[PDB]
Structures are given as structure tokens and as C-alpha cells.
Amino acid sequence: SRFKVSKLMAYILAHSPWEFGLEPDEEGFVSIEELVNAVRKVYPWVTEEYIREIVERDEKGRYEIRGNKIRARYGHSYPVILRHEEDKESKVLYHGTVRRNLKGIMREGIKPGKRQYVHLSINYEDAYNTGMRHGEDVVVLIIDAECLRNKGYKILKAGKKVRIVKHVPVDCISGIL
Amino acid sequence: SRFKVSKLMAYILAHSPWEFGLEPDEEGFVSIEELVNAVRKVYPWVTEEYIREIVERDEKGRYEIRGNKIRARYGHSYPVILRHEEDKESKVLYHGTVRRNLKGIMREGIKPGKRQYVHLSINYEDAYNTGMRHGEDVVVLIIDAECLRNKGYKILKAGKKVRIVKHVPVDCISGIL
Numbered sequence: 096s097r098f099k100v101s102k103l104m105a106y107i108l109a110h111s112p113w114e115f116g117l118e119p120d121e122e123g124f125v126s127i128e129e130l131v132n133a134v135r136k137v138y139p140w141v142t143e144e145y146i147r148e149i150v151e152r153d154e155k156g157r158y159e160i161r162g163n164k165i166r167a168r169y170g171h172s173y174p175v176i177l178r179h180e181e182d183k184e185s186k187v188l189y190h191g192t193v194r195r196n197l198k199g200i201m202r203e204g205i206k207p208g209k210r211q212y213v214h215l216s217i218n219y220e221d222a223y224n225t226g227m228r229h230g231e232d233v234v235v236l237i238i239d240a241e242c243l244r245n246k247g248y249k250i251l252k253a254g255k256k257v258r259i260v261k262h263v264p265v266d267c268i269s270g271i272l
Numbered sequence: 273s274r275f276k277v278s279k280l281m282a283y284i285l286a287h288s289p290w291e292f293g294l295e296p297d298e299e300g301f302v303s304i305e306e307l308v309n310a311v312r313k314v315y316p317w318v319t320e321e322y323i324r325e326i327v328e329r330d331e332k333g334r335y336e337i338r339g340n341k342i343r344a345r346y347g348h349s350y351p352v353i354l355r356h357e358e359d360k361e362s363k364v365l366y367h368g369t370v371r372r373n374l375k376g377i378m379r380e381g382i383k384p385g386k387r388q389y390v391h392l393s394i395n396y397e398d399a400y401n402t403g404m405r406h407g408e409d410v411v412v413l414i415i416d417a418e419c420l421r422n423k424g425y426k427i428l429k430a431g432k433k434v435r436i437v438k439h440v441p442v443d444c445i446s447g448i449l
């Protein structure tokens with residue numbers, strides 16, 4: 096299925112490319128035919144046209160093709176240089192987490208942890224879906240983006256609905272749902 | 273949670289699809305995006321990727337995806353046409369029920385009742401758990417599957433653990449757990 100192939104694409108591109116012999120450039124980009132060969136290791140119906148259709152029909156916009164190079168735009172577990180467009184439009188953003196983290200967040204703000212950035216969503220639905228990775232008892236913080244920027248933070252457009260920012264101080268959290 | 277959304281998928285696919293606007297075919301298949309859109313009236317965060325993940329991780333293999341369509345494989349409360357492969361490898365199967373039904377079963381054998389088929393399990397554990405739906409005083413009948421096949425019956429692979437047979441005569445009940 097496209098879903099299964101996409102999961103392997105995320106694994107290869109965002110998490111363990113070297114296991115397959117790929118060498119991401121400093122922005123995550125690999126050659127698409129190396130990627131296609133690696134995916135056929137597992138799913139041999141896959142071709143370059145199939146990879147491209149997945150990229151182009153992705154509602155997240157989580158993949159990016161440039162020439163015959165391809166990457167995950169965001170969410171890697173390894174360091175990448177993220178040179179993304181600034182979001183200046185959004186007034187409200189959302190961060191999904193589990194309730195046990197509120198204690199930390201309300202006194203520390205939202206911190207990027209082991210990533211370069213904190214990940215937000217322009218929709219509460221997406222923030223909830225992502226906050227679910229850490230457990231059942233999901234809460235979604237409402238974030239004041241104009242307040243973020245006025246503190247001097249820049250908000251980048253990592254995906255269609257994903258937004259990233261170095262940090263969210265408590266002052267910028269305007270509700271919990 | 274995956275629990276609640278799987279329960280809603282079971283309700284929709286196996287019990288009440290019409291109330292959601294879906295129109296199962298003669299085999300119980302609905303379009304996946306129709307299903308996703310139905311589930312999102314209750315759990316608005318649910319995506320098609322989340323539903324495909326549930327199908328994949330279901331330890332029963334109770335859902336089936338065929339192309340862009342999805343069904344419950346067995347266990348509907350409404351009548352559906354069942355074209356599953358024949359199980360020839362299992363030698364013993366299990367039927368979980370409650371003690372009060374023993375008087376009926378030993379008089380008559382195991383009867384499909386409202387369903388097209390009796391539902392058996394590959395696994396003693398799962399037979400027990402399913403039997404608990406009808407009360408707390410559960411007994412699991414050991415069924416001679418080789419006997420059923422020598423008697424004519426065709427046993428089918430409804431699920432990865434579920435097997436279905438039209439009727440189990442008393443002569444085929446090898447014991448009581």
C-alpha cells in the first residue's frame with residue numbers, strides 16, 4: 096500500500112538512512128533512485144513514479160523532492176539544517192502533549208528537547224494526533240503566535256500544517272483543550 | 273485511543289453502517305475514505321493513516337483492506353456473504369460459552385443461531401475471553417476439527433485466530449475446559 100511504503104520512506108529518510116547505504120546531505124536530501132532501490136529491498140513493486148505520487152498526494156507535505164533528490168522536510172531523529180519559509184500569517188497554533196507534561200510546560204514553557212525545534216500545528220486535530228504518540232491522556236495547548244514572534248522567535252513552515260519554533264515560553268500559551 | 277476508535281470502527285463496519293451514510297457491498301466492504309469521514313464525526317483527529325495502522329496492528333486481523341475498501345472480516349450483526357479460505361491445518365479448535373448453555377449444546381451441538389456460522393477459535397485463551405461476553409461462568413469446548421472435516425464440514429479462516437463452521441455436532445466436542 097502507499098501507507099506502508101510511506102512508513103518505510105519515513106524510517107529511511109528521517110531516522111536510519113545509513114543502514115541502507117544512503118548519505119543524506121546536510122539538509123536531509125538523498126538521491127531518489129538510491130531511495131527507490133532501498134524501498135524495493137522491502138517492497139519490490141515500488142518505482143520512482145510511485146515515490147513521486149506519494150510525495151505529491153501527501154496532505155502533510157512531509158516529503159520534498161528537489162531535482163532527483165528527496166527528503167523528509169521535518170521530524171528527523173538526526174541533526175539536519177532546516178532552512179524553511181517563515182510563517183508570518185498564523186495568529187494561533189497548537190501543541191499536542193499528554194497531561195503529565197503540563198507541570199513541566201507551565202513552569203518551563205515548551206522546550207524542543209532533543210530536536211532543534213518545538214513542533215506546532217495550525218490545526219488542533221493534527222496536534223492531538225501527534226500528542227497521542229506519548230499516551231492516551233492527550234491535551235492540546237493553544238499558542239499565541241503573534242506573542243511568540245513579538246518575543247523575537249521566528250516561526251517556520253516545516254510542512255503544510257506543521258510549524259516549528261525554537262521555543263514557546265509560558266507567556267505565549269493561551270488555553271488548554 | 274486506539275481502543276475507542278477500533279470500537280467505533282467495529283460498530284460502524286459490523287453493526288450500523290447505514291446510520292453513518294455508508295452502503296456496504298454484499299461482502300460488507302465500504303470505501304476507506306467514507307469510513308474515515310464517519311469515524312471523524314466522533315474522533316475528528318482520526319486519519320486514514322491511523323485507520324490503516326489499526327487494521328495492521330489488530331491482533332485478530334478482524335479488518336480487511338482491499339484496495340481503497342475496508343470491511344470487518346466476520347462478526348457482523350447483519351447478513352453478509354462470506355468467501356474465506358478453507359482452514360485445513362488446524363486439528364483442534366475452541367468454543368467459549370457459559371455453563372448454562374451446556375444443556376443446549378450437548379443436546380443439539382453448537383448452533384449458529386442468528387449468524388450464518390458458529391465461531392471457533394484457534395486459541396484456548398481467546399475462546400475464554402469471548403465466552404466472557406455471555407457471563408462470568410465460562411467454559412471452553414474443545415472441538416475435534418479433523419472430525420468435522422471427516423463429517424463433511426468446511427472450516428474457514430474468517431480471521432487470523434477465528435475459524436467458522438456451519439454447525440458443530442455433539443460427536444465433535446472432544447472436551448470441556
Ligand SMILES: NC(=O)c1ccc[n+]([C@@H]2O[C@H](COP(=O)([O-])OP(=O)(O)OC[C@H]3O[C@@H](n4cnc5c(N)ncnc54)[C@H](O)[C@@H]3O)[C@@H](O)[C@H]2O)c1
Pocket residue numbers: 169170171189190191192193196198199200203204205206207208209210214215216221222223225226228229256257258
Ligand atoms: N506535538 C505537536 O503538536 C505536533 C505538531 C505538529 C507535528 N508534530 C510532529 O510530531 C513529532 C514530534 O512529536 P512531539 O511534538 O511530541 O515531540 P517529541 O516526540 O520530540 O517529544 C517531546 C515532548 O516533550 C514535551 N515537552 C515539551 N516541553 C516540555 C517541558 N517543558 N516539560 C515537559 N515535557 C515537555 C512535548 O510536549 C512532547 O510531548 C514530529 O515528527 C513533529 O513534526 C507534533
Ligand SMILES: NC(=O)c1ccc[n+]([C@@H]2O[C@H](COP(=O)([O-])OP(=O)(O)OC[C@H]3O[C@@H](n4cnc5c(N)ncnc54)[C@H](O)[C@@H]3O)[C@@H](O)[C@H]2O)c1
Pocket residue numbers: 346347348366367368369370373374375376377378380381382383384385387390391392393398399400402403405406433434435
Ligand atoms: N465463541 C467463541 O469461542 C468465539 C471464538 C472466536 C471468535 N468469536 C467472536 O465472538 C462473536 C460472537 O461469537 P459467539 O461464539 O460468542 O456467539 P454469539 O455471541 O453469536 O452467541 C451465540 C451463543 O449461543 C451459544 N450456543 C450455541 N449453540 C447453542 C445451543 N445448541 N444451545 C444453546 N446455546 C448455544 C454459543 O455458545 C454462544 O454463547 C463473533 O464476532 C465471533 O467471531 C467467538
Ligand SMILES: [Cl-]
Pocket residue numbers: 105106109170
Ligand atoms: Cl517519523
Ligand SMILES: [Cl-]
Pocket residue numbers: 184
Ligand atoms: Cl491575512
Ligand SMILES: [Cl-]
Pocket residue numbers: 282283286347
Ligand atoms: Cl463486534
